[PDB]
């Protein structure tokens, strides 16, 4: 529900994101590559554990480190 407040959402597994109210997805805090874009940096995907859809913040890539010298 785009641009809506869950407290209260009379027009309506409940989570308040920066893009609106999301119903039917489970929130996690592990970042991954975007699969289905929601908006404001939030992405969603379904994967194994059956019929479970999760919402996470997008990841920008694999970190790289180099040895510093002169």
């Amino acid at each position: 529900y785009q641009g809506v407040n869950c407290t209260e959402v009379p027009v309506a597994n409940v989570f308040q994101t920066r893009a609106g109210c999301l119903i039917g997805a489970e929130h996690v805090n592990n970042s991954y590559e975007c699969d289905i874009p929601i908006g404001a940096g939030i992405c969603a995907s379904y994967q194994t554990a059956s019929q479970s859809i999760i919402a996470y913040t997008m990841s920008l890539g694999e970190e790289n480190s180099v040895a510093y010298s002169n």
Binding site: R18, G61, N64, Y68, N70
Partner: protein, 414 residues
């Protein structure tokens, strides 16, 4: 028979601003025309499927905006962290690298840029947020800049190791037509000029306010379009009033239908005009974004030989900085400053043969003859290692008579 050759140089830094994306807008077709009314809603179904077409067009524009941003900024998927040792041979990069002491991981110049751009729902109009937040854009830009600075010409190939910065500067000096010894003997002066130019750009941004007119124009145009669309909702269009509730509460259905029809036609025309002009403006913005992506890939990740594609002069480096709905480039160039006069010749005749320079020009300061390169004055003795031989001394127009030295005879004598 004259030629001018520079005896000095200066380092120059300029800026460039390019729009990338614009605001995303969604509109409810029936709510705009027949907001909370059933007679109007039932009359609207007689017109077919205009609302679906308008909604589809606006949705395609909204998707294209995110595609533009993704194409411009997310080019390289490796994240490089800020070097812990800020030793780059004397080059100051503090004003363009992220500030670790602030909650928003922006550089000082990005903070200056993000403070110069400034700045109806129940009519069915909604603005929805972009996919990538500003922090993500800043992170992409920072990773790109740090990787370019630290990895040199390796960068995306993987197995990256810290390449010394002065080696990169010498290698890019070589691509203009100047030998490395110039940089390795004027390093401190070059670094001083670079730092002064960066500070000058910072001050110029801190004082002037009209730098970002390119980015301000897009916002102004979009706001004006939306304001006109909203104001067209109070027109009469030949009916008795511009309120549906009034005419529903006053008149009977048989004539209310006629006047509601007039109002419906007016509102439909307004929506059509808005959508068409938005489509054209989106096409223009897409062209600008394509230019920005080409500029990034050809100037930030390599050297460009195209004239005036990366600022005025000979291109050395360029650094990106993020701006609201846009991108800013900082081009570093080489500019010769102090010229001097000499006499020149096309060829040298020594003992019945003509000599041409392998590189550079033959130059004379009144008595002696030397050979230098065109972009910096560095005379040296004319030998058989600097030149090559072709033909005799009667076809070239303007040949001289003296004189080629052999670097072997002293060795053979001893």
């Amino acid at each position: 028979n004259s030629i001018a050759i520079p005896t000095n140089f200066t380092i120059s830094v300029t800026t460039e601003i390019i729009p990338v994306s614009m605001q995303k807008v969604s509109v409810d077709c029936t709510m705009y025309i027949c907001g909370d009314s059933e007679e109007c809603s039932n009359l609207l179904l007689q017109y077919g499927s205009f609302c679906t077409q308008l909604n589809r067009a606006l949705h395609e524009i909204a998707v294209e905006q995110d595609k533009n941003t993704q194409e411009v900024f997310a080019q390289v998927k490796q994240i490089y962290k800020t070097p812990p040792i800020k030793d780059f041979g004397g080059f100051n990069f503090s004003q363009i690298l992220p500030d670790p002491s602030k909650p928003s991981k922006r550089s000082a110049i990005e903070d200056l840029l993000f403070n110069k751009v400034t700045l109806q729902k129940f009519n069915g109009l909604t603005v929805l947020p972009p996919l990538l937040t500003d922090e993500m854009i800043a992170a992409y830009t920072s990773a790109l800049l740090a990787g370019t600075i630290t990895a040199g010409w390796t960068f995306g190939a993987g197995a990256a190791l810290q390449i010394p910065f002065a080696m990169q500067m010498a290698y890019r000096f070589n691509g203009i037509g100047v030998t490395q010894n110039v940089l390795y003997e004027n390093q401190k002066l070059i670094a001083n000029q670079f730092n002064k130019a960066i500070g000058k750009i910072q001050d110029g941004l801190s004082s002037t306010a009209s730098a970002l007119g390119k980015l301000q124009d897009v916002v102004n145009q979009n706001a004006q379009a939306l304001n006109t669309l909203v104001k067209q909702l109070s027109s009469n269009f030949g009916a008795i009033s511009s309120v549906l509730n009034d005419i529903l509460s006053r008149l009977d259905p048989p004539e209310a239908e006629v006047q509601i029809d007039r109002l419906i036609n007016g509102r439909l025309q307004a929506l059509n005009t808005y959508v068409t002009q938005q489509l054209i403006r989106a096409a223009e913005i897409r062209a600008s974004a394509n230019l920005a992506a080409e500029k990034m890939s050809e100037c930030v990740l390599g050297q460009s030989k195209r004239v005036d594609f990366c600022g005025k002069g000979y291109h050395l480096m360029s650094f990106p900085q993020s701006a609201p709905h846009g991108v800013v480039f900082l081009h570093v160039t080489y500019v010769p400053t102090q010229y001097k006069n000499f006499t020149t010749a096309p060829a040298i005749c020594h003992n019945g043969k003509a000599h041409f320079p392998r590189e550079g020009v033959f130059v004379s300061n009144g008595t002696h003859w030397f050979v230098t390169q065109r972009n910096f004055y560095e005379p040296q003795i004319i030998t058989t290692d600097n030149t090559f031989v072709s033909g005799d001394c009667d076809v070239v127009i303007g040949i001289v008579n003296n004189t080629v030295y052999d670097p072997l005879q002293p060795e053979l004598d001893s």
